[PDB]
Design a binder for this molecule. Structure first.
Ligand code: NI
Length: 341
């Protein structure tokens, strides 16, 4: 049965609530973004209205085979009416097509549902600034002070320079980037752009990318692995054994691999700045772990919420245990006392 944190009070709306079968009273199902924990349950068998971004809609049609009649794409940054209620979709700065949803309730309450997001100061000059937001449904993935990470830009500059050096030293080296979902596409796009190459990948991954409305995409990606010096593989294959095996598949065209494993946070964010990163190396294979996050750091999340000044916060991540809910509630109370709301 559907949780309270997936329901928008005083409407017949839900958000990211596809795994409970038919939700009693739901007239419109919103989907924030195309990551499997959020879409779980959606298939060609679904027969109620789904509201989402254009990119998400492209993925629902082509990858999950949802029938077109049930997909309702909405533009960004535009006031729209759904079942008699004013809504706005905003860029979530998460993966391609990911949105936040602003609901203007009939009784005058304003609710923001972040979906999954990486808070940014640019959000403070969006449509959110035009009126008071009363209730916040918040992506709390990294709601603890130990969770620091570098900017996306610092991580991309390190990746570009690392790849350019390695391939200029050894023109027969291949660059490999791991992936398991949409998101983090700039890692492999920026490395391929510095090397003057297209990115090569499986037919299934190419199909996905061709749904993302990336300008000039046909000049950037290919299914002809041979022709390319940057390849995509499943994240599970980014290990010494998998990378040796891949090297043997490529028909001796390369004699070395440099690989990137974009992760979330792992224990060693605590000590190490990006410039100090050194790879794990076995023979002619070297692997870099790079902390490229599409979620808010603690500091980024805190800044956003202290600017917004909500009257109530409803967490949407790590809500299955008491301990976790209690710890998050302690930080929300600190933030509120510090900022005076
Ligand atoms: Ni996500």
């Amino acid at each position: 049965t559907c949780p309270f944190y997936k329901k928008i009070p005083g409407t017949g709306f839900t958000v990211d609530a596809f795994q409970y079968g038919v939700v009693e009273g739901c007239t419109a199902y919103f989907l924030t973004h195309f990551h499997s924990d959020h879409y779980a349950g959606l298939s060609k068998h679904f027969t109620f209205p789904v509201y989402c971004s254009e990119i998400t809609g492209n993925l629902l049609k082509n990858k999950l085979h949802v029938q077109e009649q049930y997909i309702h794409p909405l533009p960004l940054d535009t006031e729209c009416i759904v079942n008699g209620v004013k809504v706005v979709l905003l860029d979530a700065n998460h993966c391609p097509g990911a949105v936040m949803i602003l609901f203007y309730l009939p009784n005058g309450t304003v609710i923001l549902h972040t979906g999954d997001f990486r808070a940014d100061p640019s959000m403070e000059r969006s449509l959110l600034a035009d009126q008071k937001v009363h209730m916040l449904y918040l992506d709390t993935t990294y709601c603890s002070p130990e969770y620091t990470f570098p900017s996306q830009q610092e991580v991309i500059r390190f990746a570009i320079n690392t790849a350019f050096e390695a391939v200029t030293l050894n023109p027969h080296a291949l660059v490999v980037c791991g992936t398991y979902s949409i998101g983090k596409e700039k890692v492999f796009l920026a490395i391929a752009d510095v090397l003057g190459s297209k990115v090569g990948m499986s037919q299934e991954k190419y199909k996905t990318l061709q749904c993302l409305n990336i300008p000039e995409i046909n000049s950037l990606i290919t299914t002809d692995m041979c022709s390319s010096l940057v390849h995509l593989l499943p994240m599970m294959q980014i290990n010494f054994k998998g990378l040796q095996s891949h090297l043997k598949k490529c028909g001796g065209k390369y004699n070395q691999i440099l690989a990137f494993r974009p992760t979330g946070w792992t224990h060693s964010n605590k000590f190490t700045r990006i410039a100090d990163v050194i790879p794990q190396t076995k023979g002619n294979i070297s692997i870099y772990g790079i902390p490229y996050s599409e979620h808010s750091s603690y500091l980024e999340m805190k800044r956003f919420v202290q600017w917004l000044k909500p009257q109530k916060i409803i967490p949407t991540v790590n809500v299955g245990t008491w301990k976790s809910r209690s710890t998050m509630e302690k930080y929300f109370r600190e933030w509120k006392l510090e900022a005076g709301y």
